[PDB]
Amino acid sequence: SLSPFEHPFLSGLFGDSEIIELFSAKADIDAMIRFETALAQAEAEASIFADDEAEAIVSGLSEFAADMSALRHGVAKDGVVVPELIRQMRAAVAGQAADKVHFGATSQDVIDTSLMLRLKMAAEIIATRLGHLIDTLGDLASRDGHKPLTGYTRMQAAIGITVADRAAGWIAPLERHLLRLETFAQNGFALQFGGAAGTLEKLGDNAGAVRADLAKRLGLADRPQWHNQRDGIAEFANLLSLVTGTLGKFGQDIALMAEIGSEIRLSGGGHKQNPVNAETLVTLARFNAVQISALHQSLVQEQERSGAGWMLEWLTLPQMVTATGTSLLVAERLAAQIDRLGA
Amino acid sequence: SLSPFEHPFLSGLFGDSEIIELFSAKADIDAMIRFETALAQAEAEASIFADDEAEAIVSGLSEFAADMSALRHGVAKDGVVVPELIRQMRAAVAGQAADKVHFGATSQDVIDTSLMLRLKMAAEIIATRLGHLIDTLGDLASRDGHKPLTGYTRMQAAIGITVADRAAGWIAPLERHLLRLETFAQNGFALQFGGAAGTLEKLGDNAGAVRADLAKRLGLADRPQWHNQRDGIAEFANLLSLVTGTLGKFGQDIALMAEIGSEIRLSNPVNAETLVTLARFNAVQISALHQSLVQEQERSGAGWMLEWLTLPQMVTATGTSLLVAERLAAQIDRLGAD
Amino acid sequence: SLSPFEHPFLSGLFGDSEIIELFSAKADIDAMIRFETALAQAEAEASIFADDEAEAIVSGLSEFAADMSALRHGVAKDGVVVPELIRQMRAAVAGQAADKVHFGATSQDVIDTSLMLRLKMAAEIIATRLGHLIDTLGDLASRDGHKPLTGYTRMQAAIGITVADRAAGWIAPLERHLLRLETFAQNGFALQFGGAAGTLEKLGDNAGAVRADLAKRLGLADRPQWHNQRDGIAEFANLLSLVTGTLGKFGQDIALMAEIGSEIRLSGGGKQNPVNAETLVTLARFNAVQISALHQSLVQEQERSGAGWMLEWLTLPQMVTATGTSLLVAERLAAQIDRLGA
Amino acid sequence: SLSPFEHPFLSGLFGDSEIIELFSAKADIDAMIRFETALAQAEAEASIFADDEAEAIVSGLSEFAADMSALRHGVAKDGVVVPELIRQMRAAVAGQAADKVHFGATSQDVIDTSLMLRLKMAAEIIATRLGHLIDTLGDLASRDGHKPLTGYTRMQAAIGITVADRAAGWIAPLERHLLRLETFAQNGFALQFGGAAGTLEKLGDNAGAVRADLAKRLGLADRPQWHNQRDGIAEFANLLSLVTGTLGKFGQDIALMAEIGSEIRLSGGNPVNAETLVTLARFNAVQISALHQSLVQEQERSGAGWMLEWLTLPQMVTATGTSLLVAERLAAQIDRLGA
Ligand SMILES: [Cl-]
Ligand SMILES: [Cl-]
Ligand SMILES: [Cl-]
């Protein structure tokens, strides 16, 4: 496979099944079933059609099963999944409430909302891991903290510090990242619902009521459509890379200390002690410091909708969040190997 | 010169002398003067030395202009300005208070504080012009926004919208970036005060007091030393690219509108293209301040210096873009069909 | 899945199973086996051990089946496939010939050489499609080259041009890229044979002779080891982004021509979105981001750097894949263009 | 100033006045003058107009000085220097021969040609220096390359290698870049001459011959216009970065041998140069992406793509100039390698 993150043997190191299944094709589809189920619900709520009309759709989709073979033909002809998906969803709905699934929505609405739902789940996992790592890193500090360390400034031997002083550089920003993450989790995971041209034209002055209700049913923030406004994505991608950068600084520190060898002991048995995990921390930092540029180039999205900037997001964002989760997984592993800090 | 922002003729497009003066040698020097004046006052307040010793530093460095040749030759000897700067700074203070300048401080303290101080002025200017352009664009939205527009999704003509619909996409994210900038400027501009190896080993228990009071006097946040913690710099740089990126979308919309040419009137759209340019510039440059997150040990020259090479041009590109978008808005005689 | 190239549905636009198969574990292992077979042959040729011992290493590996699950645990602990891979390869060899596999070689030697063998097969596929695309675009440029276009400069109408005039900007850079690819293929796909810390300390004075034999046997180039020297990788990745940039320039032109919609006729019934056209711009921008990672990994410190080296693992296959997809997508695009010009 | 390469104090570390001089406004205006001079001559020679007219243009421009203030104003008005420049250049020329200056040519023709003119001189200084450094690192190696080193693989102590071993990862990639720059310098620096939309439509049938002669006088390659074909720039940008990236590897190693401090010795008055090389390497590795994002230049001219090269490329060549200067300072400090 292309990415080490999913590779049959390289995921020995780079793996993260938990994060990666959020970006599985079944996970994506299931959120698009949840979008189309809630949209009918919200429209019945806001008097666009009746309730036994919405129930007809809701239990049609109940258990819907996608034909992955025809969906792939769907992105062949269309560039996009949703025409084919909707086409099958309608065939899954008895009567002529079938005509009314997807009403008022566009392909970007459902795709980006799906993305948002799963980014939300992904950030929860990341936060929990971040909290747990801060604690792990704190446990090291409370064990070895008063022990002396030789300072190193601009690649030279500096005056003596302590273990807790150097470890303040590992823990303190991770703590700030956890704060940034939880601030973002309030507003950031948003309903995408703009319709064909971003004006919700199939709903008139009922657009507001539908958007609010559909957002509530999906556990997502209500803000008006953001088809070309990719700031939120970019901002998110920045904290994903913020996390990898700090962890990479910690990895580089651990590797350096191992090469000098006098003030760290690593473990594995009860022996080569290659700081592979430490090195992999640097690699993941550098990867995400590259990928963040994709997400920023993708702020320039012309007109009402832009495939060129939107697809660059598809190419790159999932690997950024996976870089972040794997860096958390790898750092937690490196810390378990650190048996002594200090002289 | 290498950069079109500062270039003797290319500045007619890319210039922004107001944001650039903030990165001059003189504005850096003056901010470093404000660091050591105030550091002396903070330590006098703390009771480390006396009080006429601080008063000597404060007024000794009141008329201070530095020999730049020697400064350059000092970074040519050291890699870093401050050991020579401090030498001249010491020669202007009479008596034993000359010994006390820079006490407890390192080079990274004075360099990073100076930067934060000038970045804060930079961010105010930026915040103002951003607030202004929201009003300028909002004006065009209420002047012209009743008018029909051919909508365009994925490079094909779609259903009709109005000017007010498309204007929303330019305005709304800018009001988000004002909000993001105002959130950041509460305490994103920090004092750097760590000492040689980030432990303020010269101050003892008094480290706490001095650091709070030195931050107080400079209008900077009191966050514990962040020599190898550059998370906030990267966050700040992200904001800088957020604005350029939104204005780049706006430049792109105006360029496409000019090319089709039946739903805009402009008084050829050089300004619109430059918005796309500056957007992609900063979108590249954001990478540099993320590769500089990996700052090894207690001080990395490698990571730190990459910030000297990239950060000003991020801020200037945001400044300039804010200037250029305003010139573009003034060019717009009409949005919408006839 | 994570990349759209490999994704269960999105592959229907971003997919390229032919190029991607060259990055699958099965094809990677098969290159590694190939390296280890030829290594054994080359040492016994310079007479480091016996021939029917090397011949035991040949035929032992001929039926070899990897424990995929144990290979995984192998990089979990070691960080690299090879110590375990070699351990499974010794299980595949009967007799004291099993002591002689991977003699003189290091972990990076097998990995980098395995990549080089595979990059060679990708580049021959890329170069093949490139030449055919130039030929297809050349047929667009002959059908409609006489018809006039409105010139556009700096997002404004300029003077009249012809279709041939604007087609030259799609075709001429591709012909130059084809030439760049053929040139690179002569030396650029090297052997990696350095040993534990680059100097082939096991081999002694048989160093150069064995490396030459190993290079000839595997159809790669006889250069000294380049554990910490990644300039050829960077130079190749630049080529990958050069192709995508130009095809991006192509796809953007077609996208505008479709928006204005008077000087083009696109076909099928796929509305009528220029999806393939936009995709071309996307892939161009992708590789244009990625190329910087390959450049960040030029700084590989000391005798071997895990940090620099693993960054290449993360990013490089997606560069070759994007370039390969770009050629497919451009080919599909041009097959939808029925008329350029008024 | 915005960049440390030009900075009143920081250029004590990052300065290259000799590379930076090629990017000055004066040295640019000089190049563009040469373009219009050579254009008029090439047009007289291809019989587009008469000798007497071409000579009036030559002698007008021979004592021509530019109004910088009005040029500044001119790009504020037009987005580009040339219209004002050409307007100023017509005033230098007497008679109706003034109408002929700039004939057939467009703003990008004179701008990109000028870039190409100065980049060729950048690349000659860079090649020369690169050859000289290759020598210094070789003098360094054969002085000390019998002395053993502790090898280091993936940040752990490995077996014994010698000083010459490690130095091959320094010298052998720089020798390949010298060859790459040599190769590029043959037909890599190209005359840009296409006209309003790239079709040289003013020149009719004489286009090839005007262009060939225009290219010959300016010492640049004759090739068809590349107003939207920026792969020559991209390739040159790759070369720049390749150089700084190898020098970055060199610096990183030197700093690690400095930190360990047992298998090196530095005459100092430590490893600032060593870290600077790493800085310039990760800088160029950043910038290379802009030049690659600039490959997408739409239609017959794209201001947005084109002006990204304006922002980034002068600093890439300067970083490559400075990295070379900086490695040469560092190499002059190393008195011993090995135990
Ligand atoms: Cl220091
Ligand atoms: Cl901070
Ligand atoms: Cl190893």
- Interhelix angle B163-187/A231-260, rounded to 10 degrees, is 40
Q: From chain B, pick out residues whose CB is under 8 angstroms from the CB of D1.
A: 1, 6, 20, 23-25
Name the minimum distance, in Å, from the CA of D295 to any CA of chain A.
14
Closest by alpha carbon to A218, among A194, A237, A182, A192? A192
Per DSSP bridges, beta strands D157-162 and B264-266 are unpaired
Q: Do the beta carbons of residue C291 and residue C237 sit within 8 Å? A: yes
- Identify which of B255, B305, B317 has the shortest CB distance to residue D275: B305
Q: What are D336's strand-pairing partners?
A: D265
The residue in chain A having the minimum alpha-carbon distance to the alpha carbon of residue D271 is A155
Q: How far apart are CA D92 and CA D73, in angstroms?
A: 19
| Owner of token pair 């009141």 | B62
Q: Do the beta carbons of residue B328 and residue B253 sit within 8 Å? A: no
Helix (H, G, I), strand (E, B) or coil at C175: helix
Q: How far apart are CA A114 and CA A209, in angstroms?
A: 21
245-284 of C, contacting B, C-beta below 8 A = 255-256, 258-261, 271-275, 277-278
Resolution in A: 2.6
What is residue C198's DSSP assignment? S
Query: Structure tokens of D186?
Result: 């043959």
Any chain B CB within 8 A of the CB of C156? yes
Run of H or E including A136: helix A107-144
Give the CATH number of the domain where residue B119 resides: 1.20.200.10
Dihedral, CA of residue B34, residue B35, residue B40 and residue B44, to nearest 10:
100
Dihedral, CA of residue D151, residue D259, residue A154 and residue D249, to nearest 10:
-20
Q: How far apart are CA D68 and CA D26, in angstroms?
A: 9
Q: Which amino acid is at B233?
A: I
Q: From chain C, pick out residues whose CB is under 8 angstroms from the CB of D199.
A: 151, 159, 161-162, 165
Burial of A134 (0-12, 13-18, 19+ CB in 10 A): middle
Q: Do the beta carbons of residue D218 and residue D34 sit within 8 Å? A: yes
Q: How far is the CA of C305 from the centre of ligand 3 (A)?
A: 9
Q: Do the beta carbons of residue C21 and residue A338 sit within 8 Å? A: no
What is residue B123's DSSP assignment? H
**Measured CA distances, C3 to C147, C322, D181, D280 (Å):** 41, 11, 36, 32
Neighbours, chain B (3 or more CB pairs < 8 A)? A, C, D
Per DSSP bridges, beta strands A340-341 and B148-153 are unpaired
Neighbours, chain D (3 or more CB pairs < 8 A)? A, B, C
- Residues contacting B65, CB < 8 A, separation 6+: none
State the DSSP string of A94-117.
-GGGGGGTTTT--HHHHHHHHHHH
Total number of domains in chain D: 1
Run of H or E including C266: strand C264-266
C-alpha of D257 from chain center: 32
Q: Where are the beta strands (DSSP E) in A205-329?
A: 264-265
Side-chain-facing half-sphere of D169: CA atoms under 13 Å:
32
- Identify which of C156, C273, C292 has the shortest CB distance to residue B268: C156
For B164-168, the CB contacts below 8 A with 24+ separation are B165/A197, B165/A198, B165/A199, B166/A304, B166/B253, B166/B335, B167/B137, B167/B138, B167/B140, B167/B141, B167/B335, B168/A224, B168/B141
Helix (H, G, I), strand (E, B) or coil at B1: coil
Q: For C264, phi and psi rounded to 5 degrees?
A: -140, 150
Q: What are B144's strand-pairing partners?
A: none
Give chain A's count of helices (H) and strands (E).
Answer: 12, 4
Size of interface A-C (CB pairs under 8 A): 174
Any chain D CB within 8 A of the CB of B320? no
For D306-309, the CB contacts below 8 A with 24+ separation are D306/D108, D306/D230, D307/B4, D307/B273, D307/B274, D307/B277, D308/B277, D308/B280, D308/B281, D309/D230, D309/D233
Q: How far apart are CA D3 and CA D14, in angstroms?
A: 9
Any chain B CB within 8 A of the CB of A17? no
Q: Give, rounded to a whole angstrom, the gap between the first and last alpha carbons of chain A.
A: 44
Torsional class of D200: left (φ above 0), alpha (ψ -120 to 50), beta (otherwise) = left
CB atoms within 10 A of CB D269: 7
Q: How far apart are CA A342 and CA A145, in angstroms?
A: 8
- Residues contacting C105, CB < 8 A, separation 6+: C35, C36, C39, C193, C195
Q: How far is the CA of A177 from the centre of ligand 1 (A)?
A: 28
- Interhelix angle C25-45/C82-91, rounded to 10 degrees, is 70
Any chain C CB within 8 A of the CB of D296? yes
Q: How far apart are CA D113 and CA C232, in angstroms?
A: 30
Q: Do the beta carbons of residue D188 and residue D115 sit within 8 Å? A: no
Q: How far apart are CA D92 and CA D58, in angstroms?
A: 10
Q: Where are the beta strands (DSSP E) in chain D?
A: 148-152, 157-162, 264-266, 334-337
Q: How far apart are CA D245 and CA C210, in angstroms?
A: 31
Q: How far apart are CA D238 and CA D295, in angstroms?
A: 13
Q: How far is the CA of A223 from the centre of ligand 2 (A)?
A: 30
Q: For B199, phi and psi rounded to 5 degrees?
A: -120, 0
Closest by alpha carbon to C195, among C221, C217, C224, C218? C224
SS3 breakdown of chain C: % helix, strand, coil, rounded to 5?
65, 5, 25
**Measured CA distances, D3 to A179, B108, D6 (Å):** 34, 19, 6
Side-chain-facing half-sphere of C50: CA atoms under 13 Å:
8
Q: How far apart are CA B51 and CA B306, in angstroms?
A: 40
- Residues contacting A80, CB < 8 A, separation 6+: A74, A107, A111, C275
Pick the ligand that lies closest to the CA of residue B109: 1
Query: Structure tokens of C228?
Result: 């910490």
Angle at the Cα of C169 (from C164 to C170), degrees rounded to 5? 90
What is residue A304's DSSP assignment? S
Q: How far apart are CA B141 and CA B164, in angstroms?
A: 5
Closest by alpha carbon to A36, among A70, A69, A62? A62
Q: Give, rounded to a whole angstrom, the gap between the first and last alpha carbons of chain B.
A: 45
**Containing domain of residue C112, as a range?**
1-342
Q: Do the beta carbons of residue A310 and residue A298 sit within 8 Å? A: yes
For D47-52, the CB contacts below 8 A with 24+ separation are D47/D206, D48/D103, D48/D104, D48/D203, D48/D206, D48/D210, D49/D100, D52/D97
Query: Structure tokens of A208?
Result: 């507001």
Angle at the Cα of D224 (from D221 to D229), degrees rounded to 5? 100
Any chain A CB within 8 A of the CB of C136? no
Which residue blocks in chain B are alpha helix, DSSP H?
11-14, 17-20, 25-45, 52-60, 68-78, 82-91, 107-144, 163-187, 207-218, 231-260, 270-285, 288-291, 301-331
Ion ligand 1 — residues with CB < 5 Å: A 153
Judged by CB atoms closer than 8 Å, whether chains meet at C314 and A68 is answered as no
CB atoms within 10 A of CB C272: 15
Q: How far apart are CA D308 and CA D292, in angstroms?
A: 10
Helix (H, G, I), strand (E, B) or coil at B152: strand
Q: From chain C, pick out residues whose CB is under 8 angstroms from the CB of A311.
A: 4, 278-279, 282
Dihedral, CA of residue D21, residue D22, residue D23 and residue D25, to nearest 10:
80
Query: Structure tokens of B172?
Result: 């709304």
Query: Structure tokens of C113?
Result: 């050489």
